[PDB]
């Protein structure tokens, strides 16, 4: 809750800007995040979890049509209850 | 999105949005370039090369002169110093 | 003249080449010392970098890049890598002789690390005044070595390494409120008297 200036560094996530946008690393846990001016979250994310993220970017597969495997497990056919 | 889509898979787009009639917004002093470095060499920087071999970004910059420093861009003649 | 010795005590600590302990608590990527100083050619650019590393703990492990003889040989997680082998391989030495690795890479230049966190890069007569970073510049004056990048002495070493980080968009490191006692064992005086 403690409003922090920019950048900062702690606990190995870099918080950073990087070409007039705002980003976020952590090479160390495999991903980074940044946001662009008008507001586009974007998230880079490693090989290492092939078949594991599972959640709103969906699963890390070669597959798109398997990739709604809801917090249960569960095949669905709507983008929105899941 | 569909040009930073089909940049991600490793074939890269250009000049796109010179007749889109559409920008993405920045602040003051940049506007949208494409692939341009992330070690955008600043006004407060060492002068090192050869580290920085990490990919190509999108993303809004400076001029070609015009070095950044504190969030815009200024001539390279008026770097300041610090204490 | 004798040969000096950097060292890196601990996580956030730093001997200079004439003797100088102080405190920098940083984040982001540093020079730890080069040649390319103002008017000489540049040969050498060993750099340090650390994450999670301004409060010490169990984490900040170290990344150490070093850039000689247009090669790019880093180490870190126990091993050394080599990302691009430097032309004259004659010099070149690898000495895994215990906790350490040994590192020659030239007539006047060798480097060590405990594999853990310890950098005590260590320089011939050659030099004498030759380098700067954050070890100084090497001339036997001990008080120069706080010369900033912008070619100044200051007194504050927390505001010193921030002109010496790489990316100059990353994070600069606070000014933290002097204390003898850090963050556990300000007030908690017991457990000071067991680590005292
Ligand atoms: C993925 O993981 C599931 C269980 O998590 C496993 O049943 C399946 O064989 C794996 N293969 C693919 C293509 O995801
Ligand atoms: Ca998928
Ligand atoms: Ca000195």
Redesign the pocket.
């Given at each position: 809750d403690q409003r922090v200036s920019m950048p900062y560094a702690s606990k190995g996530l870099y918080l950073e800007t990087e070409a007039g946008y705002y980003k976020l690393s952590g090479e160390a846990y495999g991903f980074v995040a940044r946001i662009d001016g008008s507001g586009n979250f974007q998230v880079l994310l490693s090989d290492r979890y092939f078949?594991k993220t599972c959640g709103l970017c969906g699963?890390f597969?070669?597959?798109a049509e398997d990739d709604f495997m809801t917090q249960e497990g569960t095949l669905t056919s709507d983008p929105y209850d899941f | 999105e569909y040009a930073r889509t089909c940049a991600q898979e490793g074939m890269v787009l250009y000049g796109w949005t010179d007749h889109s009639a559409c920008s993405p917004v920045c602040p003051a002093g940049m506007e949208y370039r494409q692939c341009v470095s992330p070690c955008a060499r600043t006004c407060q920087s060492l002068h090192i090369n050869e580290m920085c071999q990490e990919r190509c970004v999108d993303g809004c910059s400076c001029p070609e002169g015009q070095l950044l420093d504190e969030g815009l861009c200024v001539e390279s003649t008026e770097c300041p110093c610090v204490h | 003249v004798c040969d000096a010795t950097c060292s890196t005590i601990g996580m956030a600590h730093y001997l200079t080449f004439d003797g100088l302990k102080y405190l920098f608590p940083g984040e982001c990527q540093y020079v730890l010392v080069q040649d390319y100083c103002g008017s000489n050619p540049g040969t050498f650019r060993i750099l340090v970098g650390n994450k999670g590393c301004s409060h010490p703990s169990v984490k900040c492990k170290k990344r150490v890049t070093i850039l000689v003889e247009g090669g790019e040989i880093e180490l870190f997680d126990g091993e050394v890598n080599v990302k691009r082998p430097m032309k004259d391989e004659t010099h070149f030495e690898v000495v895994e002789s215990g906790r350490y690795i040994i590192l020659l890479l030239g007539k006047a230049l060798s480097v060590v690390w405990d594999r853990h966190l310890s950098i005590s890069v260590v320089l011939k007569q050659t030099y004498q005044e030759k380098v700067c970073g954050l070890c100084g510049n090497f001339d036997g004056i001990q008080n120069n070595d706080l010369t900033s990048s912008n070619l100044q002495v200051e007194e504050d070493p927390v505001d010193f390494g921030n002109s010496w980080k790489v990316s100059s968009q990353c994070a600069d490191t606070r000014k933290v409120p002097l204390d003898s006692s850090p963050a556990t064992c300000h007030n908690n005086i017991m457990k000071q008297t067991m680590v005292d």
């Open positions: 078949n699963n597969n070669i597959f | - | -």
